[PDB]
Symmetry: C3
């Protein structure tokens, strides 16, 4: 039962790292879209 | 003590699924905004 | 071995709060980009 607890926490930790990596990707793409909107407003203005 | 720990893990897992669903929602909306920017650019060019 | 478990649970919980704060920041900026695209579309159409 103690091994199951340890393994569960391992699985949670690996998954949290994947979530963190995905958040990092999301922030970068979000910043691209900010920049993209900025360029389009400046072209139309 | 082991039940206390297992209960804590259960709350972590619940929260993690909440986070995962939040990130799915974000990625879907980000996909839309990327698309919308691509459409506007094509229009103005 | 037992206190490593306790340390890790508490570190995962902390990391989940960090992640939820990042998600809240992402959602705010997303809502801004949604608004900006809507404004640009209206201007060009």
């Amino acid at each position: 039962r103690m091994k199951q607890i340890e393994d569960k926490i391992e699985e949670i930790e690996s998954k949290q790292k994947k979530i963190e990596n995905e958040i990092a990707r999301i922030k970068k793409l979000l910043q691209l879209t900010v920049w993209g909107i900025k360029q389009l407003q400046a072209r139309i203005l």
